Amino acid sequence: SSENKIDFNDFIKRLKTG
Amino acid sequence: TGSQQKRAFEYEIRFYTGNDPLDVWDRYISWTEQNYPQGGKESNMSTLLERAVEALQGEKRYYSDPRFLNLWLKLGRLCNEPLDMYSYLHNQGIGVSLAQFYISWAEEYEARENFRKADAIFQEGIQQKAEPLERLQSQHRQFQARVSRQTL
């Protein structure tokens, strides 16, 4: 189950957002 | 005491006067695994890793530093799809001169029994003469022995 694992692509997106 | 050490690290992140900020994060991360050997919610590991990457992101002086690579590798193991992280490092040139990068990358493929792509990762590491090369080649040879063992 995805539940608690990090979403890598989302993380990278978040970094770019500032 | 746990509380006190964590606070000390948090203050060090802020007040650090040196020129190697990775050192603070690297010591904070390793204290955290020393003290939370089987993880736990109280370890704060995944958030610590995210914070460390976020602070040092795009610092190319670190792209060949094994403590930097380490942050990413540790982070990758907590992702739903660790391959996304390996390919990212690969696209960005992070850790691409280190044998450890290829070893961990190859290990992820081996763990899924994708032996052919595990082998290709080794072959690229070796062509790039990633360091230490003899460790990389030794590791490759034993990957090959494991595959052989599983096909007799």
Residue numbers in the entry:
A (entry chain X): 208 to 225
B (entry chain A): 54 to 205
Article excerpt on this structure:
The multidomain protein kinase BUBR1 and its paralog BUB1 are central components of the SAC. The interaction of Blinkin with BUB1 and BUBR1 connects SAC signaling with the KMN network and is essential for the recruitment of both multitask kinases to the kinetochore (revised in Bolanos-Garcia and Blundell, 2011).
We crystallized and solved the structure of human BUBR1 at 2.2 Å resolution in complex with Blinkin peptide in the form of the chimeric protein. Although we had previously been able to obtain a structure of free BUBR1 (D'Arcy et al., 2010), the peptide-bound complex proved recalcitrant to crystallization trials. However, the aforementioned biochemical and biophysical characterization of the BUBR1-Blinkin interaction provided a rational basis to design a chimera construct, which comprised Blinkin residues S208-K226 linked to N terminus BUBR1 via a poly(TGS) linker. A comparison of the crystal structure of BUBR1 in the ligand free form (D'Arcy et al., 2010) and in the complex shows that BUBR1 undergoes little conformational change upon binding Blinkin and preserves the features characteristic of TPR motifs, including a concave inner surface and a subtle right-handed super-helical twist of the entire structure. Remarkably, the BUBR1-Blinkin structure revealed an unanticipated protein-protein interface in which Blinkin interacts with a shallow hydrophobic groove located in the convex side of the BUBR1 helical bundle. The structure indeed reveals that the interaction of Blinkin208-226 with BUBR157-220 is derived from complementary hydrophobic interfaces implicating Blinkin residues I213, F215, F218, I219, and L222. Polar contacts contribute to stabilize the BUBR157-220-Blinkin208-226 complex: salt bridges are formed between Blinkin residue R221 and BUBR1 residues E103 and E107 while hydrogen bonds are established between BUBR1 L131, a residue that is located in α helix A of TPR2, with Blinkin residue I213. However, the structure reveals that this Blinkin region undergoes a dramatic disorder-to-order transition upon BUBR1 binding, a feature also observed in TFE-titration experiments of Blinkin mimic peptides monitored by circular dichroism. The micromolar binding affinity of Blinkin S208-K226 peptide for BUBR157-220 (9.3 μM ± 0.4 in 1:1 stoichiometry) reflects a relatively moderate interaction.
